[PDB]
Subunit: 350 residues, 3 copies
């Protein structure tokens, strides 16, 4: 069984107690109110649900006797009981990898991690609740980018000159990872600290992506600013340019932004979010009402050095529909309709 | 990813070493002898199997700095290799929840737990091996009650006056948990200790259940006694009334009982149990041969304060079949036929 | 739920801290180049992939107060993110069992383990990368033997006279474990160490195996030698004879060999491996082009007492096709075509 059987137990010396067990406990009671234009469908999707995103993980580091880079590894399970889905999570569904890190050249990781692009798209630009629009939202064909991805080599640089830092990565695609395609992708991201600000830029290219009966080339570019100030204010703003190119000559473009404001004061943190996709342009013809936007408010309370309570409201107004290149409806995050969500939740880290 | 991604790891202080790892090791070597009236089907279902119900779990408590109630959480994986099923269980398949508790008002839990009704159906009734008949057995339409269920808020009262105790909960149904329905349920249970006896009462109502082309209403009532005596005798008895009501006017009723006698002597414990479903009445007319009954015997031996060995035999006589309100056979615990079972097993708690 | 509900938590004394957490970290970057005579399939199946075979497990032992044999238990999860498959593994997918052990007669284990034959087929044969041909390779009908299998009772003898050793087991088949068949199997294996050499023999018989419209009986025999010398040289050689017999009278026979050479020198270990399946004989007529071959080379580096690095190249030349007794293509490990593979990897034991 496996590349080297269980011969690891028979020949190597067990490095006893060289692990940390960790977990994030996270529950969110969330009520959803849909306006899909169908009353029956509105009642199924909408309602109260308990979105339990708790998870257990294991991680550790080892200094190999005869290797300069330090070995690192991680196995993090998925959400134990998310909303809209069944119970029980596997080990290895979130960030799971081995890797090396030397003070001389930064960090390398092989396995299942976030692409340099998505890492910025996810945080800060997706919080709180902007993900339906800015994360996996959109109308562009092909693969706008990957999120958390397996079969990935990712290199994380150290803080160069105490201001600059780099992340770059390449990997196989979703279909390639199952032996049923040859899609691949690559991407890189940059960060520069200019005082209390931080500037960000990132790129990602996806290739040989089969969808809607075509092969796709996807290119996505991103710029953003982030600020933290001592009076308590933090902000973030981001602009995102999405370009898709199909094998039948069809070109596609769509852009999007995300911005968030927050005031931390003592034991409280107030926060407003807004993100939006602009109209999608296919073959140089703007498609009417292909945009999405979402507004969001949240009050958080630092109940413990290790935990927080929070309430949150948000309203998603999605596009009115899109047609695919195969002459059938193309799924978007708004296929299920506009909806509002009100929720309270807890998060705790041990 | 998620309501707050990995922002808990980057910003919150890791409460290091504040978790418990626990497990129940449980193996059951079980031979089954089926009498379904088909020699082939008898041979597939019947035979020797290893029912491995072992499980690993994680749990903990934390006193939040600025909150009086103590935080609680649990994540329990399911059976690692049960009979009739493939190997491997996810993390979070069993009781998995967050909650708070103060000794003045008991505990509240959010997540996936046992409903107050089913908990009594589970223990003391249903043991040993009475479950096929009393637990998920029956012929009534809709949902007589839920088992272990997600999207549940449940409050467990403290022991008032050291004699009275209460459990209550409400939650989402199976289809709602996937955004495909609007079913819900609620229930309550009461306990009173009168010396060596204990009285039990419980209710559960199920609403908006889609099945066999109808919407269903379910109502279930339960009463029971339990006795522990120093001489060594222990017993339990229970009566259960189930009322279902369909959207096309059809009414349905069925009742059941469960009783068990037990003799503990030193390191040994003998136990004989009986459970039965009585004929189902649809539209106030008894349906012939819709009953089920089971007899069961078991010898247990306390090999360690932390483990037990046990032998057990049981014979199940199931109902012979009934059609649902859609004119198709309604699945029951006897769809696979009658069967007797002989088994040995171990249980261990770390 | 289950054979005894959650009554183990309610009555038994938690044997706190009698659990060990263990894991094997294993990542392999593997490039594949397929030449199946189909270009689209060559590129889907072929390419670079990251085969993460890491795994977490738990094991422990307990001395029961009122039992002389020591109780042992194990729950080992599966590969967290293997190549050609999705992410996330269950708890209990690798070796998972309960058992007892006394120094007088060895150990007995109930659950999920390797059959005495496969353990030898697995290690030392099949390494490095000979498994496609020697492990699950072959063209014989029915089931030559089981891999890691559930519903198994297995006995491992002590080291008799410091030279002799025996392993034997019996269990249920793949279909029987799901209530859909009555297949079973049994097998035994013996080892004798003569100085720097070691002699190996094993047998396994499988019965009531349903496939290709017939029921099958399988008989598989194996002999092998292993050598370790102070010079640094080690080798292994194995011959395998497989006999299958169908319910329509059709007989089939096929044999195979596996061989490996290794030179350990300081912190490096070189290794050449070869394994092959010979032409398949059905009804005493050798079938043309049913043989399989694989050559493999490997460089290993003991990077730490607890880990190794390795590079590996290997060439797989498979059979040209075979028809089953149902007059349809019979799946073999070469159905997807020939492929060569170049790979690097790390393995770590904590
Ligand atoms: C990251 N969260 C994901 C989110 O990315 C998204 O994923 C969609 C997925 O739902 C779509 O699939 C959905 O719509 C299909 C329309 N023909 C039918 C099947 C349905 N599950 C996929 N076609 C594309 C993914 N990006 O919706 C599911 C989710 C779990 O919330
Ligand atoms: C630093 C602050 C920057 C704020 C930038 C805000 C950009 C706002 O532009 C939004 C344009 O998109 C409008 C979306 O229209 C709604 C679409 O929904 C209806 C279906 O078409
Ligand atoms: C314990 C000693 C180990 C010996 C292993 C020897 C490995 C090399 O032996 C190769 C023998 O190959 C035989 C080829 O058989 C031809 C096919 O005949 C079978 C007809 O069904
Ligand atoms: Na709903
Ligand atoms: Na990295
Ligand atoms: Na992806
Ligand atoms: Na590939
Ligand atoms: Na069987
Ligand atoms: Na349920
Ligand atoms: Na993969
Ligand atoms: Na098997």
């Amino acid at each position: 069984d496996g590349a080297n059987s269980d011969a690891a137990k028979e020949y190597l010396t067990k490095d006893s107690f060289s692990y940390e067990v960790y977990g994030i406990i996270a529950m969110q009671a969330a009520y959803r109110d849909y306006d899909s234009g169908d009353a029956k469908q509105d009642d199924n999707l909408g309602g109260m649900q308990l979105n339990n995103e708790s998870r257990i993980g294991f991680r550790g580091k080892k200094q190999f006797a005869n290797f300069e880079p330090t070995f690192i590894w991680q196995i993090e399970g998925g959400y134990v009981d998310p909303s809209f889905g069944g119970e029980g999570a596997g080990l290895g569904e979130r960030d799971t990898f081995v890797g090396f890190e030397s003070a001389s050249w930064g960090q390398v990781r092989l396995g299942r991690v976030l692409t340099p692009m998505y890492e910025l798209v996810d945080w800060p630009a997706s919080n709180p609740g902007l993900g339906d629009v800015y994360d996996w939202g959109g109308a562009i064909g092909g693969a706008k980018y990957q999120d958390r991805q397996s079969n990935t080599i990712r290199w994380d640089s150290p803080m160069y000159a105490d201001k600059f830092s780099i992340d770059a990565a390449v990997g196989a695609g979703d279909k390639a990872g199952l032996g049923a395609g040859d899609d691949y992708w690559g991407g890189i991201a940059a960060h520069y600290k200019l005082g209390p600000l931080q500037l960000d830029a990132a790129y990602e290219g996806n290739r040989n992506i089969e969808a809607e009966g075509q092969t796709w080339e996807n290119n996505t570019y991103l710029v953003g600013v982030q600020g933290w100030f001592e009076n308590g204010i933090s902000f973030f703003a981001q602009y995102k340019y999405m370009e898709a190119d199909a094998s039948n000559g069809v070109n596609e473009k769509q852009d999007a932004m995300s911005a968030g404001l927050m005031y931390t004061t003592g034991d409280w943190q107030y926060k407003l979010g807004y993100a939006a996709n602009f109209d999608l342009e296919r073959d140089g013809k703007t498609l009417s009402n292909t945009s999405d936007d979402v507004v969001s408010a949240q009050i958080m309370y630092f109940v413990d050095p290790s935990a927080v309570l929070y309430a949150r409201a948000r309203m998603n107004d999605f596009n009115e529909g899109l047609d695919g290149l195969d002459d059938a409806a193309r799924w978007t995050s708004g296929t299920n309709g506009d909806y509002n969500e009100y929720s309270v939740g807890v998060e705790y880290y041990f």
